[model samples]
Target: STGSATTTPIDSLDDAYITPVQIGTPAQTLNLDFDTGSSDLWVFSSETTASEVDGQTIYTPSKSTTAKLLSGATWSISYGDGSSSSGDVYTDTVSVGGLTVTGQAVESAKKVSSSFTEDSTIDGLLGLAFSTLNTVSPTQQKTFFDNAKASLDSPVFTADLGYHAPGTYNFGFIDTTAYTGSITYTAVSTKQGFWEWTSTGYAVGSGTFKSTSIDGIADTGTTLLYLPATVVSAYWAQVSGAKSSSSVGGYVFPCSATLPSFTFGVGSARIVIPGDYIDFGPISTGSSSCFGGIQSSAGIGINIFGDVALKAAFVVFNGATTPTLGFASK
Candidate 1:
């Protein structure tokens, strides 16, 4: 059956969206982050140290009659944000929306970084990346999407990530009503286990579009859009009071600064990011200083089209012989 799920933004942190997923026989439900950046489905579980769990709902595999341990197997993952989690493996019935997959590999965390332990709201991560990126040892595991795709009418999923509003993730079907205009398709390179594509170029404000290509990955897990230092510098220059601040880190600007729009090229289609969205928020709660959402991916090697960029368009992740990405105005 074609499956669909609603994604909600966290009240305090609008950085990521969380979706409810069910695992095991009685179906222990957990609020998980559907991360397109990574490929491991791990959860805060009974195996995790009680002190590290905080307020998260742990997955109890022992209670699920269908659960079975993948003997001598282990999994560990580290994020670009420095967050990490490591755990043992178990195969169980995993369900998302109405889609079900038997014997899905579910990682039960034995240890987690402070970033995860402190957040507490997210119970686990439901990785949507390719199965080749799965972290299980001895034998790599397949993601829920990989296993369920064979039965789908079309091996595709659409991510309608919103900005401080409810969004939807649709599998096996694309809702034409969700987007406006024709979708501009671009070929994706999955050699790195990510939806990587080369953007034709970018422009600042209403300036002429640059033609230099930038290689980057489409990552839902990343909160902000990252580009080359030169590109970020160009955008900030258009703002009157914007500057790189060592104290605040990255680029910070006066709250009242009149920001300009940023545009990126994909095929013949141009995705424009409004100035307001670029102003992430105040340095602190009531501070007058604000951070720019577009930061430098200087050392990271590859740029990232995170939430800030994705929210500006309708993204379609096509899982076909040659994976492709389709973008349309939202």
Candidate 2:
């Protein structure tokens, strides 16, 4: 089966991406973030506390004849930003785009953090990463992708994230017109349950391309690109007034600074992330300083090729028995 969906930015800064998903028999549709970095298809549901509910839609299992409670099953997850959610589990018919899966674990959130509550644009997250990352206790459940891969025309999914424009996500099939030139394939490591791979190297603007290996994951769920301290430092050095500030959080630069484009390698392909993509946005409502889209992942332990980098190119998450990644220019 081939599934397709359109992803739209949640805000002007493209802080998060949202795609519509259908859950259960009566079809409770919700705007969910298709996250390739985490594997837990959780959602804001009837189980969630009323106060924690902001303006987001919730999935009510009782309304769906196909929904069945996974007795005594529970799950919980905490993100890098300290945002968290926990809930009981249910098996229901879930669909993304046109692709449908039965008995898909639909985590019904009973509690959520302020971040998730406040960001009403996102109803929940649909896990696209390896099922090994699933947070369910007792017996872990397969991610929606993992469960659906068996019936997919091809064991693959692709992400074409746009800077400010709406983008496409395809399952089981690759649309040739979506990219240019030849697609470059890279080996992926699923040991960490992420779409993790090593970058060949990177360059600042038109500067030298370092031929070193940089391990990172392609995460559409995340908003920024995070690289090694050395690489991040090199890129920021080109911008005159940029500095790392703990008080302000990460790296911030003068809003007027001319940021350098960042380029990374995938096989022989040189994916260049435009300079403007690195200028995240203003530090505050009217602050003249801007938070960088690219920051150091040194402190996070794992580098992240988030939307900032992923949006610069077309990315393929191959779910083959021996998985690999494919990159192409758009």
Q: Tens digits of per-residue lDDT for model 2 on 1-330?
A: 999999999999989899999999989999999999899999999989999999999999999999999999999999876899999999999999999999999999999999999999999999898999899999899999999999999999999998889999999999999999888999999989899999999999999889999999989998999999999999999999899999988999999888889999997789999999888788889999999998889879999999999999999999999999999988
Clashing pairs in 2: none
- Provide the lowest-lDDT 10-residue window in model 2: 276-285
Tell me which residue pairs clash in candidate 1: none
Could you estimate the TM-score for every candidate? 0.97, 0.99
RMSD of each: 1.3, 0.8
Write down the TM-score for model 1.
0.97
Q: Tell me the TM-score of model 2.
A: 0.99
What is residue 62's positional error in candidate 2, in angstroms? 1.0
